[PDB]
């Protein structure tokens, strides 16, 4: 069984924070000691899943639990090259039946990564980045003649400039 | 006027006024003149935070000029009676009753700030009426300064010959001289 | 200002102020002067317990320096009317109409704590007229004297003629010795 | 202060005031002096619970050191026009004016409590000016001092001789002399 | 204080307060001294009810000891100038202005209480200053003295010989010779 | 106290005060003497009103009998400058300042009830100190005595020299005058 | 009291009063005299438009007798400090406190009404005490007006010479005078 | 009154009271006299402000002729023991407490608007009884004159010898005195 | 998927358009000087959308996004000419089946768009304005003969006048 559950960090906090913090006494770290979400599952017991609602019950017949660390940007760069069913592999046959050909330089990624971060959203989140960049492109590829090789830099993610086309 | 807060919790936001907020921490406050209505207020916080934990350490801001006798044994009892350890803390200054209700908080959860000042002397009164009478209420006030000062010495370590003189006549006593006197434990100037 | 508390109950979240949540605990509060407006509010609250729960026993907490007597009178006839024990304890000060209420309380059930004081005199009264109104006025306290003391027998268990020798003039009677005068049953020093 | 409550009913939990608790059960509450304000506020209670139910008996609770006559007047009016029979309970005291409201009530329905008290004396008032004023002002006031004793013969079942008597100066009336002089039913000492 | 009752609709439940619920049923009362705060607030309440609906009829319960007379003319002519019939009551008391505005309610639809009591006399005023500026308020006042008796006698059908005689002194009329002097219509003894 | 109104809307049902429904209207009551915080409050009102519509009409009630002249003369010049037409009303009563914002208002737009009454005299003041400061204070009350007349002759179509020698001495008007004299348009003796 | 508005949005209808209706459009009042507490009240409503928009004018309408200085230059040092342009507007009278924010205004944005007034006048002030003291609070109020008297001729234009002579003593100006004195742009007659 | 304002979130509308607005941004109003009350609610503020964030900086803007000591001194204690560094804003005058918490603040983050004025001078006090209690009073204020000279120089910088010869006296600085002083740092003329 | 959103824009607008706090120091950002509808959409996100109230894994199913531009008033006057759907052609076929031509000058369209944006019911409201108007004329045109041509005026929309007809 395997389910993202949506705001476990808030339950887990209040057991690892122990304090409010609103007296002379007690101390008070908001930001500077805040608890980071993929440590924070690491800590993670049966007790903590009740108060979410799950029955005790059902938590004793599955013992093993498996926590899974958030996507890193060094990460999102092996994603894009390593696997085979990679996006970067994907739009590269996309084309390859249309007889041209696509690139994807180590500028372009470290960028891509940067933005896929902050949506919050994973390696799902990263067809958004690339489709909305080879939007124009791709609207107008066909149509063109004697194109055989596209080449997409640093600043085309940006959208400053545009992809540069090679002509055969 | 009194500004509202707002306490971003799981269920959703929550409007408190500013004193609200602080009572649900465990925190009391203690302003102004010390009389049978803002006595009797006191005590109902006390045995709210009582029943939701009684294993939490109160506290207890005092910035108090002194007042009625009767309506301040009320609270010194209650601190008492009850199990958590209520912390006391001199704010300001703390008057003849303020800083009875001062050293009578738990052992070692007794503060008093840098600047803070604290004042005792006797109990206060008068009557007019019959010779008889006066009598009666001169025995009782005097049953009071007795019981006043046996309390003291309690709570301060000192004896009851060194709190019937210290006590004859107001008696400022600086933060230091507080913690050497037994009033207090330590002073919380910085939060470390 | 009154404190706004959060009770946590299953159907939601509910704001209370610090009286009304005692009040759901069968706790009331008799603060400062005994008058018709304050005690006639006392009352509303008993008849709203006993409908609530007959047999579940009611709390009275007294901090006052008494007041007028008819105003108490109606809270102590009420107190013997419903079936609920009422217990009652003293905070602070109980003065001549406190004090008749504390001992009105049920038997066993009456409680005073180790610093407060019980004062007990005669009714106060005057009148400026004719002397045929002046003799009306005269005998209808001198009756309220005398059935004050016949009821104060009644729960003291003491004899009419002791109360009217002590209650001839001001007497003060400390927690320990209201224990043996038989108002009170016990002193709640701590909580074990 | 007044303490809020909770009503528990099917469709949800609701917060209600003391007072207005009551008034759902047909209960009303006569406090402090009886002026136009006050007495106007109690007349739309009884209109209020005319409508709500007419065959259900009201409950009318006095504690009052009486006051103005014309104000005290629209409320006996108020109790003989409307169907619901308005029972009467005496708490504490009931003056000239509070006392005639008792007595006003539905026969049968009328009680006192064992230390409760009644007191009667005739209508009060003074006047300045011409020769020519006084005289008019002072038939008119002792119309009303007829009056009052007509009514009070009507509900007592005494003869208007006696009341004339009775009245001429103030008389106290303890609440087992009131039974057999016909002012009330009998006395709620317990709760059967 | 003012009690808040629950109006049961369709809709759901809703809370208001006595004086609110009675609005709703078109019914305004006139309690206290006339002043033009008092004034103003009534002439609001007339307005709205007519717009709800100007078809039925509206009550106006008066008890008052009288005030401002420029206070209430202003009351007066509003119930003239809308179409709805402002049914007027008296309760305890109608001074020389509460007893011009229940006259001036609808012919047919004027009644007073068993034990009410009206009153009626002439305006009273004063001034100091220059002998030409007491002249102008002498003439204004008595004007106004000569129109209060004309609209009294069109009201009441007598003649204005006769409210001249009437109204030089304080003159208090019973129940029953209101309605023998054309002042109302009948008499709400008991509900039929 | 201020009576609540229930608004029956498709959306839903919302409470309102009795000032404040009509405010809804374009209705703006002008009550009590004529200050900067009450003359501030309506200047916000006819702002508001402008801004949601500056095609409909605007009504204002007056019954006041005046008060500071300059506090006046800020609502006068606000009617001036906006578009929409100010109705005026007189109920009651109208002053110096509070008939000059009476004739101020819309040309054919302003009414006297029947038995309204209008009293415009001279500003008043006074200042004690130098006498080069008198003289200072002197002529600035004698612009606007000026100024005050200008304009009162422009809305009421008078010449200069009869308001001056009317304006002299306290001067009061019946509502049939009052049209005659140009102050008004008309009279709202019945709802047609 | 203030009346109650509801503002029609598209989310659903809210609740606003009148003084924070005017508020969402950038419109400030300022009444009554300056003192500490409304000082300090008007300061943050100009802060909390800078940060919603600090490209949109602010409209500052002024209805004052003047009042402390210190209280006054608070408002004068935040209108020059905070970028948005502060429209002044004089309704009814400007004292010399309230002319020193009326000029204060951003220029090509300031206005009077046709019937306002102006007045200015040098500081007032006092002091008890010794001959020592007398003069350290004499040479601080001579500051104040050199000061005053500086910033004037800034937004005014004219030289240091003339206001010092012009502020010997009161010295009234009419909206025509002022707008030829430099104090404001122009008039707002009417709107077009 | 208080205006009311809307602070729009992603969440919904949610209504603000001015004042609970600008404490959202650690901002906090220190206005009137220092008093026991007034020096109780401005920690309450602190305190919150801490929990919510502990590295980000509060502004407090002080508008006060003085007042108590004893009130302000817990103030002090408060800024000095919480880890944020509570900037300080002189507006209108900053008294003799006024001015020891606006020096107080955090070095670097002081500001003077320019027409900002602060005042400095000794203690004040006062005492009626023997002369053996007039001693006891002399010396406890004389140790806080020295302390707080004492502590004015740490943060000014100045020595402990020129701030006994200047504040013997009442001493008015302005606001670029201030600045050369060591009182504050810089002057917040325009928005940059 | 596709759908209005009421009230985004300002969830949008609260996040992008501000970096300034309240207080004295505090920098004020000067920005929104106009709605921008269209092109505040453009500058959408997923963390947006999360305070909206939709969840962070059903925004993830759908990574492209498409912001459409809302409708202006010459916009309108091309839907009624250019498409082949527009109204015009519509009723234009309507009375070709009668043998009636049919006219729409441009004198009455600039009209009708100002009429649409008022109502703030959009294109789909446009009927309403057309209908209104040929009501009378399609009343009385089967029993009408010899008509073979209709021209409606900018004055027929506002009701003056009466369409032109041609025998």
Do not use: W
């Given at each position: 069984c395997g389910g993202a559950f949506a705001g476990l960090d808030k339950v887990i906090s209040h057991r690892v924070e122990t304090?409010?913090?609103?007296?002379?006494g007690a101390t008070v770290k908001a930001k500077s000691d805040k608890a980071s979400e993929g440590e924070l599952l690491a800590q993670v017991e049966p007790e903590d899943l009740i108060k979410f609602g799950l029955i005790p019950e059902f938590i004793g017949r599955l013992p093993v639990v498996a926590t899974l660390n958030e996507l890193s940007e060094e990460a999102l760069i092996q994603i894009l090259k390593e696997?085979?069913?990679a996006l970067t592999k994907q739009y590269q046959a996309l084309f390859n039946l249309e007889g041209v050909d696509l690139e994807f330089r180590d500028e372009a990624l470290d960028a891509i990564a940067k933005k896929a971060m902050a949506r919050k959203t994973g390696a799902r989140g990263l067809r958004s980045i690339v489709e909305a960049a080879l939007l124009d492109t791709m609207y107008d590829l066909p149509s063109?003649?004697?194109?055989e090789k596209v080449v997409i830099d640093e600043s085309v993610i940006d959208g400053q400039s545009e992809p540069l086309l090679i002509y055969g | 006027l009194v500004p509202m807060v707002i306490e971003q919790t799981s269920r959703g936001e929550r409007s408190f006024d500013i004193y609200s907020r602080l009572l649900k921490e465990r925190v009391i406050f203690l302003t102004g003149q010390v009389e049978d209505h803002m006595a009797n207020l006191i005590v109902a916080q006390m045995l709210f935070l009582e029943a939701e934990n009684p294993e939490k350490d109160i506290y207890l801001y005092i910035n108090s000029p002194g007042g009625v006798i009767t309506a301040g044994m009320s609270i010194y009892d209650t601190m008492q009676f009850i199990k958590p350890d209520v912390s006391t803390i001199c704010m300001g200054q703390a008057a003849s009753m303020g800083a009875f209700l001062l050293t009578a908080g738990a052992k070692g959860k007794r503060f008093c700030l840098p600047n803070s000042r604290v004042m005792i002397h006797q109990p206060l009164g008068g009557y007019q009426g019959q010779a008889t009478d006066i009598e009666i209420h001169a025995r009782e006030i005097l049953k009071v300064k007795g019981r006043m000062n046996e309390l003291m010495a309690l709570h301060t370590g000192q004896s009851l010959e060194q709190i019937e003189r210290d006590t004859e006549r107001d008696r400022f006593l600086s933060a230091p001289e507080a913690v050497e006197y037994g009033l207090v434990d330590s002073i919380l100037t910085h939060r470390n």
């Amino acid at each position: 069984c395997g389910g993202a559950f949506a705001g476990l960090d808030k339950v887990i906090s209040h057991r690892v924070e122990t304090g409010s913090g609103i007296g002379f006494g007690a101390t008070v770290k908001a930001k500077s000691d805040k608890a980071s979400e993929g440590e924070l599952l690491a800590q993670v017991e049966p007790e903590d899943l009740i108060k979410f609602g799950l029955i005790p019950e059902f938590i004793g017949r599955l013992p093993v639990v498996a926590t899974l660390n958030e996507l890193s940007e060094e990460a999102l760069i092996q994603i894009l090259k390593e696997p085979k069913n990679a996006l970067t592999k994907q739009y590269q046959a996309l084309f390859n039946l249309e007889g041209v050909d696509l690139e994807f330089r180590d500028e372009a990624l470290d960028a891509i990564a940067k933005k896929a971060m902050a949506r919050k959203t994973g390696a799902r989140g990263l067809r958004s980045i690339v489709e909305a960049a080879l939007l124009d492109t791709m609207y107008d590829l066909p149509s063109m003649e004697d194109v055989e090789k596209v080449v997409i830099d640093e600043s085309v993610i940006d959208g400053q400039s545009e992809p540069l086309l090679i002509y055969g | 006027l009194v500004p509202m807060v707002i306490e971003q919790t799981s269920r959703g936001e929550r409007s408190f006024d500013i004193y609200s907020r602080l009572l649900k921490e465990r925190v009391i406050f203690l302003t102004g003149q010390v009389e049978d209505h803002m006595a009797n207020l006191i005590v109902a916080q006390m045995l709210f935070l009582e029943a939701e934990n009684p294993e939490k350490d109160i506290y207890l801001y005092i910035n108090s000029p002194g007042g009625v006798i009767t309506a301040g044994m009320s609270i010194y009892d209650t601190m008492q009676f009850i199990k958590p350890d209520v912390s006391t803390i001199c704010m300001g200054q703390a008057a003849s009753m303020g800083a009875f209700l001062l050293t009578a908080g738990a052992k070692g959860k007794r503060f008093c700030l840098p600047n803070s000042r604290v004042m005792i002397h006797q109990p206060l009164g008068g009557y007019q009426g019959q010779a008889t009478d006066i009598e009666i209420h001169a025995r009782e006030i005097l049953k009071v300064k007795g019981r006043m000062n046996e309390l003291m010495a309690l709570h301060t370590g000192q004896s009851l010959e060194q709190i019937e003189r210290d006590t004859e006549r107001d008696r400022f006593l600086s933060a230091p001289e507080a913690v050497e006197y037994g009033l207090v434990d330590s002073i919380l100037t910085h939060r470390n």
